[PDB]
Amino acid sequence: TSDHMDTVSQVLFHPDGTCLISSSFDHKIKITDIRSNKLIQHYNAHDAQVNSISIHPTGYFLASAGSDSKIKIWDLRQGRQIYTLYSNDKDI
Amino acid sequence: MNNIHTSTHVSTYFNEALVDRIDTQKYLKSNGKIKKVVSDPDNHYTAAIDDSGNITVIVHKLNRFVSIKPSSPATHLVFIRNGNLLVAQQNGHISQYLASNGKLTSVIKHHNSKLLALEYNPVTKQILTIANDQCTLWDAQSFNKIKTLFAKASYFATGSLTPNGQSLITSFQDGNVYVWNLNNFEVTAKSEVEENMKNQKISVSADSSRFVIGGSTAYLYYCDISHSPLCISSFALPSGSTSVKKIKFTHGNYLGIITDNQVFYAIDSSTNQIALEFRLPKNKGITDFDINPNNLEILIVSGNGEIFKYDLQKLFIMEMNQQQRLLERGIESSLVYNVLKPGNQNHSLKFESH
Amino acid sequence: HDPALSRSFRGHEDIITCADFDPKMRQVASCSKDSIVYVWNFKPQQRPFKFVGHKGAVYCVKYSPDGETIAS
């Protein structure tokens, strides 16, 4: 609580299995490392009933999904949200 | 002695350069006249409501129509991309028909209200109903519910969804305008305001960076998310406005307005000034509107019984020209439009939102 | 440089919770919230397989890196 509110969603990893990624019902992704359980940024997520995620294989993109039907993609090499996607009815 | 007539700001504009006609002889069969317009988010299936109330979907390429047998009138219609019609009926229920047949498929009920104002978000699959003291949010397929927003006392006036994105804004009689996490039932943004307004409605842009509030008092409020508070300012209206009955957003930075002086207006929110002014003969009159955004194809229902028959995009030509001829002289738009100046905090609907 | 929704899995009954892929590029596995998972490919003339199991919801399906076994 690394701050999450409820039932945590998918936990993802840096390509090397480090810097794990998590969010839950709370609208934020935390990217935190292993043992050295330190945060690099708050990857604010969707205001979803619940969120969801996968990260592009290169570890560059956080695909922020969730129970609501807005979808957005993050660029981890920048730390910006790239943008909120058109989405067009997708509670991914 | 004395008041204003006749039809010079409306039927003369509306029918200026048509390529077809609503041959109203085929529609106004009631002993009586057309009273209200409700309409299609997919634009083409706009519909007429007469003093009987049967909804006639006017199909503006066929000069044919869908006669919906039940006489119950709509507050507004919602249609989806797949061919269905969701009718917010004035009977307290929302009734879905195959749009393609006028064939009843289902009814959404839970509401106890006279009004069920609808808005449909085609990019969320979500339809919202504004009714009585609640907002019902539901899956646009319309066979279940998502949430019932409500309050302990402040009574509800309005709210809406965002069609090319998503965020839910609602307001109370208090004028308090606030933003919801529509999927968590969270008020994430809150306001307390000075201007209380009866029967106010919130117009929500498809990309809801911008919002507008109407209501029983003669004011209009405009929001812009790029600035804090989201509602940064308020302003009073062109002389003669008494209240605002209906406000709706279009594609450009614009909203249609119906006031209770029955004059309709088109407002440019980039400046908060009126582009178009619409007037009809004494009662008779202008009663409601339908704006279809790509060209602003319009269905207008006038108390004069005429069913229009126009595109605002085409009417804007007259206030594109005119103004551009005057721009050769250098006429100022803030006067042409009547820009409505931001006022005091004493009557604002100022609202912080993120 | 487009999100590129291409062509969806037409026919998914309702209620969808996941997907994974066979890196042949590709066969797609997907799963519903009730009794069913699907596996199909492009060359769209190809037809999907409808698998029955997971009488309750199925939340996730996954393929081995060779696109072989699909755990569900």
Swiss-Prot record, chain C:
Consequences of knocking out this gene: POC1-deficient mutant cells display a temperature-sensitive lethal phenotype. Mutant cells also exhibit reduced basal body frequency, basal body organization defects, and loss of oral apparatuses.
WD repeat start and end residues: 11-50
Subcellular locations according to the entry: Cytoplasm, Cytoskeleton, Cilium basal body
Role: Required for structural maintenance of centrioles, ciliogenesis, and cilia-based motility.
Family: Belongs to the POC1 family.
The protein's name: POC1 centriolar protein homolog
Organism classification: Eukaryota, Sar, Alveolata, Ciliophora, Intramacronucleata
